[PDB]
Design a binder for this molecule. Structure first.
Ligand SMILES: Nc1nc2c(ncn2[C@@H]2O[C@H](COP(=O)(O)OP(=O)(O)O)[C@@H](O)[C@H]2O)c(=O)[nH]1
Ligand SMILES: Nc1nc2c(ncn2[C@@H]2O[C@H](COP(=O)(O)OP(=O)(O)O)[C@@H](O)[C@H]2O)c(=O)[nH]1
Ligand SMILES: Nc1nc2c(ncn2[C@@H]2O[C@H](COP(=O)(O)OP(=O)(O)O)[C@@H](O)[C@H]2O)c(=O)[nH]1
Ligand SMILES: Nc1nc2c(ncn2[C@@H]2O[C@H](COP(=O)(O)OP(=O)(O)O)[C@@H](O)[C@H]2O)c(=O)[nH]1
Ligand SMILES: Nc1nc2c(ncn2[C@@H]2O[C@H](COP(=O)(O)OP(=O)(O)O)[C@@H](O)[C@H]2O)c(=O)[nH]1
Ligand SMILES: [Mg+2]
Ligand SMILES: [Mg+2]
Ligand SMILES: [Mg+2]
Ligand SMILES: [Mg+2]
Ligand SMILES: [Mg+2]
Lengths: 285, 285, 285, 285, 285
């Protein structure tokens, strides 16, 4: 009946159902004393405190314990009364076969969990999966659908390329690259001097003004994500729709490019989710 | 019972049966993840995603894996219920003997294939073959049949000449030339500067306004396709019927010629198919 | 006085001067702590660690920062005492005009650089440029020069065709294709399952026995590089000289072809360099 | 002052001045990257690379862009110092009136051109024109001049007949036929099987041993060029002087004919040029 | 003359010279009455009792009072007679520049100290520094040097990764993680109940059987140190050499991994020291 979309992501989880929103992908099974005060979920006796701790850098995200974050998002989006829903997950455009390993464990499965002590249960009627990037196309404006575009989802570790002709995909590819490698690069020189920073506590430092990131350190990352797309796409052609949070981290610089036709998608952070929302409406409704 | 006509072509496939239409000749056996979203066919365990990828530039088109495109066209034209049909293929006017190598593999053969996952089967009662150009004559209007005409099919790589006297052919020839060489010429100067274009993604660029093709670049191609026909035909004589997609690419210029009597065939893209359709009606029906 | 030849290439750099040799085209500007242990060069304050990192997939290789690799090759080939030399670079056969943008920045220019901390300087008397493929002809044996041959340089991303009549070139063309697309194809299915491989760390895997490349995966690449040469050359004619590293990657299979006269050039990896070496001798000496 | 003779021909250009010689009639305006390496001429901003490309099959050779080949021959025959010369062109024996359209554009005209980058200029004092065949008579030996002969110039597409009584012409005619039609005939069956040959790259194949031309395929061409001369000449009468390159292509067979008196002209390839050379000497000198 | 190697470490000091050995990194400046009975060193009037007390958790170990432990190790390794030696210290692979701040204070410096009341003096001819991990490669067996390996030094707080191709390093990185965080995790739940344990007195408890460490508490730490290496290395590739004491704390579990090729280095505790010993021999001797 109700429909929900969950982009697990590697550093941010983005859910949209009856109530939309997002949070961080950090998950930790470590023991914690002041449980009342964290965001936590206990599934079949194992507890996880979300929003803090490690990052689960594992690739191939159909097996990276996509477990407590999913239920937490389901609880946070819908309400306690809801029992049966329809899930529309978003896997990368190169790992779409892994849905076989994904449906077998979720479809027609009843999940009971605490969600901060207020225990509840939820079932899913049917599961659905879409590739990242492709979904963001549907959220796109009509003016861009007609032409030949190139959805370029710049994730945290995955760049997903989906070249769309007049309402038909042509090229579909994935590249291992994103903001995470940039964070590793920054820490490679920061931790070197005397410090102890890591990939998780390094974006907040830039936000709060401790890491003096030079203007050209972003230019290098731009030219590195564009020296990995030439074999598959010519950006001057194929009017582009930059999406993903990484785009907003470089929006002030992506607009100063020698590209003849392009744009940065509005609400890029939630585009891949909103488009999948439309698609789910089209299918079930 | 039912009749179908399939012009495989080198850059466009054109089929006409219960439901007419066309598509691109691009075929690729490359692995693709998001299979659901492409147009695909799996024959005896080998899969092909049609409409994207390579071009299969091989000449002598009786052996260029005329395999998945044919079945895809058969499925797209007729319906799932249909089992037995009559095929009327169109080989060039110089490769008509190769029908021997063509009939032996198709006549009385049952073909089973997926066609985007909805597996089906089809048999062909008898196979028939006609030369390109000659067939387009039958689709021609009556006013032109009476006179002495010269069907000039300007394909992508083959110019087929069929000189018809009063309902009887006289001269029959094939020339290696067409729009593909023009595309190669354009890329020879475009890719030279800094670019990476190829023969496949170069027509769309002209359509979408990135390649500033000069007016005389078409004039050169016209005079090059006419400096290859003088030995066999004098165009001023033999009222001509330009056909093939290449003609429409030059219709605005072919009409400004110093030729005493000529025309560009209407629906030239599908003339060679419609005429063969009439001929098949005449034979079986 | 001294003469040097440098084929920058896209995945391998090949230099021949007083001391010949080669290395990888990988270049990275990323900060590195243990500088002593890498191969590095600092030019006008920007440092580059060669042999590791990215690949610089940019086409039109007259602008792809052909900068630190060139000086590194110059230092590694000649000795510290040498000051003035003559450079004979090798551009592709379709980008030979870009020498205008190449000579203006190098001719009569003194370059000072570190080369692993032992700072030195070097000047070049005059610059010279030759097209890829054509140069490899001169390294060829006499038995093949007399006839009508077709130098077919199968690079990593560029196939360069130079058809030579009796000591005179006829056809000259470039095609965007090579081993890099094959690596992308392999990773398209390897990274799909659960892995994280990329075009750079994928050949070593084949060498060390982790990627079970099927025998027909090479056959597909052969027939794909031969379905891109028919319009320009008929391989049965024009006795062929396969060159480039890609040929050695397929030497065991290129010899089982239905071609009437052909061969795989010995030391194909360095043929395009040795031939240019002869030509430079002829010109200056 | 100096004198030059230029037989443009349809497949071979033959010039004789201070330095004699010949080359191929192939001309192409197509863009080419490695300009240094071809034989090229740029006239008033349009460039042509001679010796490669198309063939310019147009008849009535007073308008077939007789433009870059002429200047190239002039430059190659004479030297850079020469400024004013006397031209003696050779039109067919049926198109001798077209000299009106030829003199108006050349006489007293200064032509400036590059000739492979070494720009130069040249003027012509007066222009002269002679018919093909007739000129070859003057190069003939004295033993044949006295009698009643029949100059039979077997060109590539034109057979020129000039019947000479005792130093006076009687019959003068032209026939559309020659080696080009034979090449078209050969390709009509070669390209049919699977191949892609054309009239331009088909003689070299015979020379290099790929086309197994049967002995009687030449006999058919002989009897076809002799079934087109009976109405105008009886070959048994009128002791004949076969000239033109086509004769050398059939010299081994023309000598086995049932003709009472005949011969194949020595240096037939250059006879029509040498005779015109004598005539020019007679007129101006 | 004599050579010594000192790995200060964060929880263990490891020295190798004329006499090898190790001890604990605990250092305390606190006053102690029964001085005779402890291991102590007094430098320029400040005394330190080694092997007991605090731990000096400071990172960037080029400034963490690397002072009394160093001299104590020097005295314990060599003998009283020795005056001049050569030091080969081991900094992490990300803090190798700090050698600048290290050499300035030690090179050519005479140090006088008590060493349990028997005052003595020592000078160092020259100082040398190597990165952790890289040094352990030299102690490795020949069978592993030839291949492409990945030295993975699992320290107490630092994981040092050095990817070695055929005798050449490629990737060099440091990660803040190790056994110390595991000890903090254990105490987080032990001290919670009623206890007062700390990171220093918690390993001995496991050894002596008071802390019932579950088998999966080590598995969590394994998967946490492997969820921090995927971005930089794929462990299935790059045959690995686990080193550092942490490896021995998990040797019984590291061998049950789904890794295709790996091993735990013998004498892992002293590998990083022995390899540096070889390197020092190579350089000075
Ligand atoms: N400057 C800026 N950056 C943002 C904002 N929101 C997200 N980002 C960046 O976008 C990245 C999130 O990547 P994400 O789209 O979640 O990757 P995914 O989880 O793999 O899909 C983070 O690294 C952020 O730095 C924002 O509001 N401002
Ligand atoms: N301008 C224009 N060109 C067209 C159109 N349809 C087809 N063409 C051109 O016609 C060519 C197709 O050639 P085709 O007839 O399929 O060759 P064949 O496959 O060998 O028979 C393409 O290169 C197109 O550029 C059209 O609607 N407009
Ligand atoms: N099997 C094998 N392959 C090789 C060898 N050397 C080079 N190659 C292949 O040749 C390719 C190098 O292409 P290259 O000639 O450098 O392209 P270019 O840089 O554009 O000129 C690589 O992808 C290698 O896989 C060899 O010794 N054995
Ligand atoms: N066997 C042979 N044939 C030749 C030779 N030279 C020229 N030919 C033939 O002669 C023809 C040239 O015809 P040509 O006299 O130039 O015709 P034109 O240009 O119209 O005057 C070519 O088709 C060649 O096959 C030769 O040395 N040997
Ligand atoms: N089980 C076991 N563990 C050991 C042994 N020796 C050392 N360890 C562990 O290894 C760790 C020492 O780490 P270390 O290599 O000194 O880190 P570093 O000082 O930063 O280089 C300690 O936490 C010990 O628990 C041993 O013999 N047995
Ligand atoms: Mg994403
Ligand atoms: Mg056609
Ligand atoms: Mg190359
Ligand atoms: Mg002639
Ligand atoms: Mg250590």
């Amino acid at each position: 009946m109700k429909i929900t979309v969950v982009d697990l992501g590697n550093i941010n989880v983005k859910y949209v159902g009856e109530n939309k929103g997002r949070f961080s992908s950090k998950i930790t099974n470590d023991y914690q004393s002041y449980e009342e005060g964290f965001q936590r979920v206990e599934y079949n006796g194992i507890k996880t405190y979300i929003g803090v701790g490690e990052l689960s850098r594992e690739f191939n995200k159909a097996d990276r314990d996509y477990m407590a974050q999913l239920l937490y998002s389901l609880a946070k989006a819908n309400t306690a009364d809801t029992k049966e829903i329809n899930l529309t997950l978003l896997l990368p455009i190169i790992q779409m076969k892994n849905k076989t390993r994904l449906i077998e464990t979720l479809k027609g499965e009843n999940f009971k969990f605490k969600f901060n002590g207020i225990d509840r249960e939820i079932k899913i009627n049917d599961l659905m999966v879409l590739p990242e990037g492709y979904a963001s196309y549907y959220s796109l404006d009509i003016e861009n659908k007609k032409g030949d575009v190139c959805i370029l989802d710049l994730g945290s570790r995955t760049i997903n390329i989906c070249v769309l002709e007049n309402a038909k995909i042509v090229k579909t590819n994935t590249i291992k690259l994103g903001s995470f490698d940039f964070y590793s690069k920054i820490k490679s020189l920061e931790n070197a001097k005397g410090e102890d920073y890591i990939e998780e506590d390094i974006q907040r430092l830039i936000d709060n003004g401790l890491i003096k990131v030079d203007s050209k350190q972003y230019i290098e990352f731009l030219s590195d994500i564009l020296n990995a797309v030439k074999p598959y796409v010519n950006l001057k052609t194929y009017n582009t729709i930059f999406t993903g949070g990484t785009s907003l981290m470089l929006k002030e610089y992506i607009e100063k490019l020698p590209l003849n036709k392009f744009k940065v998608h509005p609400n890029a952070l939630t585009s891949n989710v909103d488009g999948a929302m439309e698609a789910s409406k089209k299918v079930w409704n």
